[PDB]
Amino acid sequence: GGYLLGS
Amino acid sequence: GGYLLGS
Amino acid sequence: GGYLLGS
Amino acid sequence: GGYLLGS
Amino acid sequence: GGYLLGS
Amino acid sequence: GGYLLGS
Amino acid sequence: GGYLLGS
Amino acid sequence: GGYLLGS
Amino acid sequence: GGYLLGS
Amino acid sequence: GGYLLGS
Amino acid sequence: GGYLLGS
């Protein structure tokens, strides 16, 4: 899969 | 605020 | 703010 | 895969 | 501060 | 893969 | 400061 | 591969 | 296995 | 605060 | 703060 994070 | 998505 | 994407 | 991060 | 970790 | 953020 | 690490 | 950032 | 610790 | 993970 | 990872 993977990941995505932020603000 | 912010966001975090994982697969 | 900022962003981080991983695959 | 790979990664991308920044601000 | 704080921490965030995962996969 | 995965991620770890600390502040 | 802080730290960010991953793969 | 991977990444490590420290401040 | 392994270990991960921090603050 | 902080975190400790073992496997 | 800081981090320690072992495998």
Add this chain to the structure above:
Amino acid sequence: GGYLLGS
């Protein structure tokens, strides 16, 4: 395996 530590 290996290890990674820092601050």
